[PDB]
Symmetry: D3
Amino acid sequence: MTPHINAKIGDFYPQCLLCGDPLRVSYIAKKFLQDAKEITNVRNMLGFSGKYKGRGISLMGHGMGIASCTIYVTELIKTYQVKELLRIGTCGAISPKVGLKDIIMATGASTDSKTNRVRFLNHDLSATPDFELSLRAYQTAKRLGIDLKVGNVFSSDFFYSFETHAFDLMAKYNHLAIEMEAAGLYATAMELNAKALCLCSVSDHLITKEALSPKERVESFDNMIILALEMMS
Amino acid sequence: MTPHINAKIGDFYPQCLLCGDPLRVSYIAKKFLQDAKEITNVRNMLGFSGKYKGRGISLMGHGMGIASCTIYVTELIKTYQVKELLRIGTCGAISPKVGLKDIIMATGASTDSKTNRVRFLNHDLSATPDFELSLRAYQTAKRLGIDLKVGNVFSSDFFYSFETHAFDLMAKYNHLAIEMEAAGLYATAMELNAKALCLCSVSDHLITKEALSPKERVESFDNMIILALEMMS
Amino acid sequence: MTPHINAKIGDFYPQCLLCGDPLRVSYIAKKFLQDAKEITNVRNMLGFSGKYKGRGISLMGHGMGIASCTIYVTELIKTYQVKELLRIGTCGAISPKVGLKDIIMATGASTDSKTNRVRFLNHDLSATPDFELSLRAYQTAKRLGIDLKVGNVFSSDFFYSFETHAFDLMAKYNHLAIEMEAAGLYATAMELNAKALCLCSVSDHLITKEALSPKERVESFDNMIILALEMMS
Amino acid sequence: MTPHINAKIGDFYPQCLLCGDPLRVSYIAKKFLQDAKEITNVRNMLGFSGKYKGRGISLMGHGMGIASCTIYVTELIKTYQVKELLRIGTCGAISPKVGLKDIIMATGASTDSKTNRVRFLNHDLSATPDFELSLRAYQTAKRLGIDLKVGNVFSSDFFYSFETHAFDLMAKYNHLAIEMEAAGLYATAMELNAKALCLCSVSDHLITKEALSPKERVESFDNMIILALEMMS
Amino acid sequence: MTPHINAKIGDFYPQCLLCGDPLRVSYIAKKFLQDAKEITNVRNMLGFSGKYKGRGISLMGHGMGIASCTIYVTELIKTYQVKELLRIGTCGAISPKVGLKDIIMATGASTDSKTNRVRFLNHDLSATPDFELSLRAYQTAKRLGIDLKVGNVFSSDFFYSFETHAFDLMAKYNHLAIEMEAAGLYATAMELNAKALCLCSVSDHLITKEALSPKERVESFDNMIILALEMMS
Amino acid sequence: MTPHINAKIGDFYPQCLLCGDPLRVSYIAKKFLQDAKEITNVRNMLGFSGKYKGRGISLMGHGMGIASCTIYVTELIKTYQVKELLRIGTCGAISPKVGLKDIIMATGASTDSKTNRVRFLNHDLSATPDFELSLRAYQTAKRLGIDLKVGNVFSSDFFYSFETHAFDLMAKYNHLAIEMEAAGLYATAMELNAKALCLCSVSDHLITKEALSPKERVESFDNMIILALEMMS
Ligand SMILES: Clc1nc(Cl)c2[nH]cnc2n1
Ligand SMILES: Clc1nc(Cl)c2[nH]cnc2n1
Ligand SMILES: Clc1nc(Cl)c2[nH]cnc2n1
Ligand SMILES: Clc1nc(Cl)c2[nH]cnc2n1
Ligand SMILES: Clc1nc(Cl)c2[nH]cnc2n1
Ligand SMILES: Clc1nc(Cl)c2[nH]cnc2n1
Ligand SMILES: [Mg+2]
Ligand SMILES: [Mg+2]
Ligand SMILES: [Mg+2]
Ligand SMILES: [Mg+2]
Ligand SMILES: [Mg+2]
Ligand SMILES: [Mg+2]
């Protein structure tokens, strides 16, 4: 129906888990869902619908960066009637308050993008998640025994930053890590009256240069997948 | 020992309620606190310390606008050891999702100020409250039977706006009301690693133009004072 | 009559002395005026009308920062028919050309605020005083034998600056001191076709670190008060 | 070896064709290359190395938006030593000088992104291709009988624009069409001293609403693919 | 001695009259000065030194636009030791407070240029003249019977404006006319510790569309030349 | 027929060589053209029409800086029907890729001006030349044995820069030299659907501090004059 999704209307459940990497979306479908069906594959951006503990859930890839994420989120809401969007992904830590394998709930997404100024009268849009979803993540993490870290992230247009000298200042202002999509998800969900939240897993520390190995990346990401699926039950 | 506060070091409790109007601060001290002492009065900007249900509580006026708010909040944190700052105040509603008497909890504060661009590398700082405090407000409001509305506010440098044509756009993006200080409170608490939250009571609707009577403004504000004091007890 | 002033129309004389501190406004009324009457007290922001050497003079406090100052100045012009607004206050000197106790007449007010960009097509508004009032201040200072320093000030949204490294640059560009309201007074008076001027007294030197004692502050400020009242006779 | 490309060092030829859609990349490898090997597939972002008329050429997908494109282009140039990057793709025409089927060569890429201001001291970076490549494209098109349209494109962070009222203005300034990556490819190739060029095929007209069927889209895209490969051969 | 001035060190008097049009500079030297010597002519941009009523007077052309004016003013101050710079020129009136043949003294120069943001830490520089010079102009105009109009001008990078819809707003904020150099003269003189002032004669009314004939333009300009020379004696 | 040009309609050929220095325009007319006639001289900004190798050529001075250039280019296109504008000039090198006496073809013109943001929706206009003219310059330089350097220039509002610390960054991004008009010529020709190109000759190296002597300046400029006239023949 859209240039970027070839699902039929109704193929998506009203709650959708989002991730930048469509191969990880496929991995979640195979490992954690029952009866999962591939519903879209335009540009190799895979999405699925299946069941977790008897509950229907959808999964959709969104690519990297605010511009890509905004395209998919816009279409999910406007065309596919998605109401609740839970994004997961990795991030690079910049604060001493977090370490490798930590899960962060982004109560705000700062950015170096111009997109929110374009959307919002050239002023400062404070891009934020839906509070009910934030409460649900916090409650579910308490239930599962997960030490959820809570603060802002910085959504950058740059993976290869030209402003590494500014990381300490961002950490001072309660930015725990850097990723590339949260501000676009939040602003699009705000634009279109939908509920959204971003969780992210610390795979790399940008201050120490320490990184997880491939094997511990998969293990730690699984912990955040389970948090997300449990919160959608 | 600041240009703006003449309290002695140690006169403030670590939890402080903030309001822009020092006469409303004095009203809270007289009506709701026990043994309230006026601890500061530079520029007629009054602050107090007293007890609510046996628990020490301080109150501080902060004046109008981000620049004034920032001065007082900075001094409270850096000189007076204040750790938790709960701002209450009125606001002008701009969204159909709220009406007069509603209490809004601002999970984000957008702004037309340049102050956060000056603080934050000329990028977009998403100014947000402390999550734990927002959870406490949610739980306390539920206990008290308050239908707490949760979303963004827009903190303006203007009371007499030159951009009233933009109010519908702001409301579309989940801005429930306009006030003049929240983004500064939030940014200063982020800067200084303190816990802050803003609650605001809808006194007027800037769109549909309804307005509370002076007698309803008292009952509605009292409702929000009680929420705040119960939160800090 | 407004949310911020509870005077009756007619209570203000057409010339009004402005100061951020309502307690200093009261002090001027009691020390320097005859038959002074308190005409407003909303938010503890006092204003008065009285006589100086047989001539009617009003005084009004305006709080701290551009947003606070703009609210009061807007209402004084639009509602209370004030035509001439003479602001006094303290400042932090940044130029070697001034020292403690000097009085500065601001022939321009630069700013880090975004307010003038919002007002003025996103361009640079050169915020300036009324020329007749500047001439009167210059002539009155000569008459009184005051060495009036004439240059720009920098009106900042920050008392606790994040840009102290730029003070020398600002002084190079003929900024003699920093305060927090002149640019808003000037822009509002420009907006509404009224006459405004700001004088400020050097209470502290931000470069040399020299500072007046509490008692020296009161004595030098009196010299400014006299200059101002004399220009309004 | 890089986070977004799992090719071996040396798997890329120094000439690489780029496209946002990795499924079109795989289509090109299957239909136009001989002995094509899939050399990378992280995030389902496919790249290939194969031969066209006896010469080795590589293909790489880059996703949607400047941020995504910049990631892949940076890694291609640095880790994989790619020297010539020829991007093809579709675009939405905004000018009367072009229509469906037309191939545009972008001698400049304007943008609503902030990325180039971040890169370029907050000034205006004129993002441009390598001139020798643009000359090779012009000569190859002439030899093949292609009526190459030459002008600027506008690279937007938005597929769903909030500024459709501005399309006529852009077309007046010689912007023939809108796409989402050219300015990022050009800025990154400038940063890293590599040769880049963007060609795009008009598949939709955003003014008139002309739109090609899936069959015409394939046939018109083939003409661009052949132009690109002939340029590299 | 500089790339733009071929005068010898010492050829300029410390007082210099400035004008954009070097042909008008030559006209002033021939008609109003005694013993006038042409001291510079690079790029046909003429300067002179002569006598007016026994007093040494220099004249220098500066071209059109802030960037051109800035070049000449910088060299006059830094290399040729000029201390006082009095600019005359024409302007396009935008205010009902002025009409054809009026002389405006610019106590502020607003601008659409980025130059002052580049100079002034990305903030708003309020570009203003030296007050002593403005007082001398006021007194001299009174002595000569000239009804000098006093307010801001808007210095634009555009003669052929793209923002004519904004002229009324500019006029509301006390901008009497538009020209193209004042803000650059004022900022450069502030930078380099020199005394500057701009006067301009209304040659065309941009609102009412009134314009002066070629012959009328000459006679009204003479009145401003005499004012400037009388002020410099 | 305009405020800045007093030629009659029809006095300009449709191809015009442009230079900032009207005395250099005069020098070109007398040394390289046959039957040259002065056609305009407002503000001493000279322009001529003559023949080179039997072919009609016009020459016009445009002064210094984007604002001055824009005035003349706008009038030449809109009033005098000029269709092709070839600008020559000097520049200050900032890249190791170029040295004194090198001729640069500017395939893009970056800028610190605000003019293109004002023209272009506050976004980034990539200011570029006409491709056919650039091909003609490239081919003509090859024919004449000139080693034409091809890259971006930076068109600045400043001859005396406040940002010399950024020169290396701009060179990294393929900016070979700094001048002051190219971005304005390019934006105006794009605005008005005309063909433009800028060549510039390195007179000074801003990094190494090398400079040409006065006689070297004339001799090296002659080589680019011949290049330009040859491409117009
Ligand atoms: Cl390690 C890492 N991860 C992510 Cl998600 C990033 N986003 C921007 N820079 C980044 N670095
Ligand atoms: Cl009614 C109302 N209240 C507040 Cl606090 C405001 N701030 C800015 N505009 C406003 N309107
Ligand atoms: Cl000492 C001093 N006084 C004032 Cl009024 C100020 N405004 C901003 N910084 C300041 N410092
Ligand atoms: Cl049809 C179309 N195609 C592309 Cl590539 C676009 N980019 C931004 N808007 C767009 N519209
Ligand atoms: Cl009539 C006229 N004169 C001048 Cl000096 C101008 N500057 C910018 N627009 C203008 N119009
Ligand atoms: Cl040497 C030199 N030449 C030119 Cl054309 C310039 N433009 C800006 N700075 C400059 N330096
Ligand atoms: Mg991820
Ligand atoms: Mg309030
Ligand atoms: Mg004060
Ligand atoms: Mg594409
Ligand atoms: Mg002039
Ligand atoms: Mg030149």
